[PDB]
A paper describes a structure:
Histamine-Releasing Factor (HRF), also referred to as Translationally Controlled Tumour Protein (TCTP), p21, p23 and fortilin, is ubiquitously expressed in eukaryotes, and involved in apoptosis, cell cycle progression, cell proliferation and cancer (Bommer and Thiele, 2004, Nagano-Ito and Ichikawa, 2012, Bommer, 2012). In addition to its diverse range of intracellular roles, HRF is also able to activate mast cells and basophils, with the release of histamine, implicating a role in allergic disease. HRF can form dimers, and a disulphide-linked dimer was shown to be crucial for the cytokine-like activity of rat HRF. mHRF, hHRF and rat HRF contain two cysteine residues, at positions 28 and 172, and Cys172 is suggested to be the site of the intermolecular disulphide bond. The current model for the activity of HRF in mast cell activation involves cross-linking of FcεRI-bound IgE by dimeric HRF, mediated by interactions between HRF and the Fab regions of IgE.
We report here the first crystal structure of murine HRF (mHRF), solved at 4.0 Å resolution, revealing the conserved HRF fold. The structure of mHRF was solved at 4.0 Å resolution, and contains two molecules in the asymmetric unit. Residues 1–38 and 68–170, and 1–41 and 67–170 were modeled for chains A and B, respectively; similar to other crystal structures of HRF, the mobile loop region (residues Thr39-Val66) was disordered. mHRF contains a C-terminal His-tag, which was also disordered; a substantial region of continuous electron density was observed close to the C-terminus, but the tag could not be modeled with certainty.Fig. 1 mHRF. The overall fold of mHRF is conserved, and comprises three α-helices packed against two β-sheets, while a third β-sheet forms the base of the mobile loop. Like hHRF, mHRF contains two cysteine residues at positions 28 and 172, and thus has the potential to form a covalently-linked dimer; while Cys28 is buried, Cys172 is surface exposed. However, the two molecules of the mHRF asymmetric unit, which are related by non-crystallographic two-fold symmetry, form only non-covalent interactions. The two molecules bury a surface area of 176 Å2 at their interface, in which Glu80-Thr84 from one chain pack against equivalent residues from the other, with a hydrogen bond between Ser82 from each chain. Furthermore, the human and murine proteins are 96% identical, and the residues involved in forming both the disulphide bond and dimer interface are identical.
Residue numbers in the entry: 1 to 38, 68 to 170
């Protein structure tokens, strides 16, 4: 069994039980799940994901403070990743803020303000949820 954890806040985010697809040229992970009623998202309820909200400036302030934190973790763990990290993120941050009204925010269990903020949206069918994480801010245990 594979468990993907946040590299910063050490919070449980998701596992390999869902469909994992790669997007943004290897920058973000596309975790495909389904709606289960025990009604909620299976990926959210199974990993203690705490929901939060951000404004256009607070998220831009956070994502600038968080993407810098991941770049520092790459400089100590995978220095060759720093170059493709800033390139795809600059295009991705401009893609997230452009579609800011379509994403929902979630944080780790500890609710650390420095942790990862996950995004949630729906496919063209409107009922299949998929979550967007940062691939470089995860540790595979």
């Amino acid at each position: 069994m594979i468990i993907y954890r946040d590299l910063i806040s050490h919070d449980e985010l998701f596992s390999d039980i869902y469909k994992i697809r790669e997007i943004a040229d290897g920058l973000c992970l596309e975790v495909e799940g389904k709606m289960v009623s025990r009604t909620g998202v299976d990926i959210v309820m199974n990993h203690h994901l705490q929901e939060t909200s951000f404004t256009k400036e607070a998220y831009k302030k956070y994502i600038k403070d968080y993407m810098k934190s991941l770049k520092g973790k790459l400089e100590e763990q995978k220095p060759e990743r720093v170059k493709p990290f800033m390139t795809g993120a600059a295009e991705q941050i401009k893609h997230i803020l452009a579609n800011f009204n379509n994403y929902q925010f979630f944080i780790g269990e500890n609710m650390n303000p420095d942790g990862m903020v996950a995004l949630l949206d729906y496919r063209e069918d409107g009922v299949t949820p998929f979550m967007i994480f940062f691939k470089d801010g995860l540790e595979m245990e």
